[PDB]
Structure 1
Amino acid sequence: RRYRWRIQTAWDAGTVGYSLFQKFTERVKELTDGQLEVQPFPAGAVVGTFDMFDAVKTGVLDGMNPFTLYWAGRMPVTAFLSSYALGLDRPDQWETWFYSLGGLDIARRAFAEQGLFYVGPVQHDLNIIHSKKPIRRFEDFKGVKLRVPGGMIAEVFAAAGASTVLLPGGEVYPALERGVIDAADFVGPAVNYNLGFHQVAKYIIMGPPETPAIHQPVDLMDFTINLNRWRSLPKPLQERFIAAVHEYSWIHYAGIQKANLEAWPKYRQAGVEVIRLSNEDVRKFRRLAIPIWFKWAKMDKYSREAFASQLEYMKGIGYVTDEELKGLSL
């Protein structure tokens, strides 16, 4: 018997990300000798991006390739299954945490309670911010209407005085064009260019060279499958799909990074100015961020479990000092 799964991605059609996702479906067919095929759908083709969770839960979709933290408002732990401000900031650190420090099992247990099978994380990129007006220091965030992906990311910017809004990446261009928002984070340079941000915002705001991505340094995607659908798939094919997703994680990461190298010169040609914040701006954000990490960790049992092991790992690699954790504990 052969299996066919409908899977929608958070990537919009006409982006480098969707092209990579389409190629993944061909790779899955190849690795399973046609026994398991994935029918790809670009963002919004079946349901809205933020509605994918419920669509997969019910079976309208068989699976999804979202940015994991989109479920932060309903599953606290998902804010810890993708990067948060000023924490672990390299792809390899998130890979180690998931694959040898216990992160994958925490994600699987949390998603199983929701009737979903979390396959694994998909590496991707850091994220940048586009702004219509210059934001040159920490204090310039006050009063900025900023699109962000909710959760802990939005909470940190709200603590910096911004008015945050949640919108799918495909709605950012018209929101900026119409002046509904002043600035927007979405993903890295290449996809944001595919979406036209350079024509509706003349600035890019990044951290200093020492900390280029303050809010989302490792913006992970994942594959999450309807649990019944997953359990119905023969084990040999389940294992081949897990391996296919892990291989794709890095093929996707590499494809996005190649496109990003090609994108920076295009921003220069479009007259977009890249503004770099300072090391002191980062210290200000850090004092806002750390207590917010603990607030989120304290929401439920899974968020606490995930943050506890990430905090131990950060201490082990010198990312956090005991002094800056004064008054904060699990």
Structure 2
Amino acid sequence: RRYRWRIQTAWDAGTVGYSLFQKFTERVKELTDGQLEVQPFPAGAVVGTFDMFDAVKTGVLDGMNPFTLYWAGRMPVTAFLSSYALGLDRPDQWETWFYSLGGLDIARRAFAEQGLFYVGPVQHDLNIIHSKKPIRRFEDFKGVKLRVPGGMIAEVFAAAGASTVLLPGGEVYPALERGVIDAADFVGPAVNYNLGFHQVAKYIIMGPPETPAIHQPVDLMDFTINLNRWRSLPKPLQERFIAAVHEYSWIHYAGIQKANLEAWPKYRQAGVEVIRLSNEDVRKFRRLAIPIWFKWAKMDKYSREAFASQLEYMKGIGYVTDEELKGLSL
């Protein structure tokens, strides 16, 4: 017997990401001998990106491939299921936390309460900022109307004085063009180029070579399926799909990084200047970020569990010192 699932991705049509996602659906058919077929839908095709969560919960969609932290406002734990400012910043660290330090189970338990089955994370990229204004130091963020993905990311930029705005990636170009926003933090170089941000913003803002991405060094996506639809899939196919997503996580990551390398030369020719903030700017953001980690971690039991296990890991690899944590607890 054959099963058919409709799954919408956060990737807009015409992006390297959507192409990768399409390819994934044929890999799934191959790995299941045609027994599990996924019909891909680009961002907005069935429901607005920010409403996918509820659309999957109710079953209009069988599943989704979102940027996990989009649900931070309704599920605090999701702010910890993707990178946050100055925390773990390498793909391998997130892989370790999810797959051996207990992250996958925390995520699954939190989503299960929502009637969703969190399959696993999908590696992706660090994020960059596109700005119409040259933001060369920490102090230049004050007063900047900045599109960000809400949650803890938005809070850190707000603490730096920015006026944060929540908008889907597909609405960023017109917002910049119309002056609704001055800058935008969406994804990496290749996809941002696909969407044309270089045409409406001549500056790319990045951290120092030591800390390239201050805010989102590991911007994870994932695959989350309606729980009822998941439970109806035979276990053999469930296990195959889990493996398929884990393989895709890195095939996706690899494809994005390839496109990114090819994108930098393009920005140069577009007349875009890549601006690098300093290590001092990183220290100013760090002082604001750590307290915010704790504020978000204490929201519920899931956010507490995710953050506590990530904090112990960070202590283990020298990413945080006891001194910096003075007065902070869960």
1:119 paired residue number: 119
**Runs (5+) with no aligned partner, structure 2:** none
CA distance in 1, matches of 2:217, 2:259: 17
1:278 paired residue number: 278
Deviation at 1:315, TM superposition (A): 0.1
Secondary structure at the aligned position of 1:328 is classed as: coil
Deviation at 1:273, TM superposition (A): 0.3
Query: Scaled by the length of structure 1, what TM-score is found?
Result: 1.00
Secondary structure at the aligned position of 2:38 is classed as: strand
Question: After TM superposition, what 4+ stretches of structure 1 lie above 6 angstroms from structure 2?
Answer: none
Secondary structure at the aligned position of 1:319 is classed as: coil
Query: Scaled by the length of structure 2, what TM-score is found?
Result: 1.00
CA distance in 1, matches of 2:284, 2:148: 19
Deviation at 1:285, TM superposition (A): 0.1
CA distance in 2, matches of 1:296, 1:57: 24
CA distance in 2, matches of 1:308, 1:136: 34
Superposed CA deviations along residues 16-40 of structure 1, whole A, max 9, x for unmatched, are 0000000000000000000000000
Superposed CA deviations along residues 46-65 of structure 1, whole A, max 9, x for unmatched, are 00000100000011000000
Superposed CA deviations along residues 222-279 of structure 1, whole A, max 9, x for unmatched, are 0000000000000000000000000000000000000000000000000000000000
CA distance in 1, matches of 2:263, 2:280: 28
Secondary structure at the aligned position of 1:280 is classed as: helix
2:184 paired residue number: 184
Superposed CA deviations along residues 88-110 of structure 1, whole A, max 9, x for unmatched, are 00000000000000000000000
2:238 paired residue number: 238
* 1:25-44 matches, cutoff 5 A: 25-44=25-44
CA distance in 1, matches of 2:268, 2:180: 25
Aligned length: 330
Q: Are 1:298 and 2:260 counterparts?
A: no
CA distance in 1, matches of 2:70, 2:315: 27
Deviation at 1:308, TM superposition (A): 0.3
Deviation at 1:329, TM superposition (A): 1.3
CA distance in 1, matches of 2:212, 2:307: 23
Secondary structure at the aligned position of 1:127 is classed as: coil
CA distance in 2, matches of 1:187, 1:289: 20
1:287 paired residue number: 287
Secondary structure at the aligned position of 1:302 is classed as: helix
> How large is the RMSD of aligned CA atoms in angstroms?
0.3
Secondary structure at the aligned position of 1:40 is classed as: strand
CA distance in 1, matches of 2:137, 2:322: 27
CA distance in 2, matches of 1:213, 1:133: 19
Superposed CA deviations along residues 61-101 of structure 1, whole A, max 9, x for unmatched, are 00000000000000000000000000000000000000000
Deviation at 1:314, TM superposition (A): 0.1
Secondary structure at the aligned position of 1:329 is classed as: coil
Deviation at 1:196, TM superposition (A): 0.2
Superposed CA deviations along residues 142-164 of structure 1, whole A, max 9, x for unmatched, are 00000000000000000000000
CA distance in 1, matches of 2:310, 2:155: 19
1:3 paired residue number: 3
Secondary structure at the aligned position of 2:312 is classed as: helix
1:324 paired residue number: 324
CA distance in 2, matches of 1:324, 1:130: 31
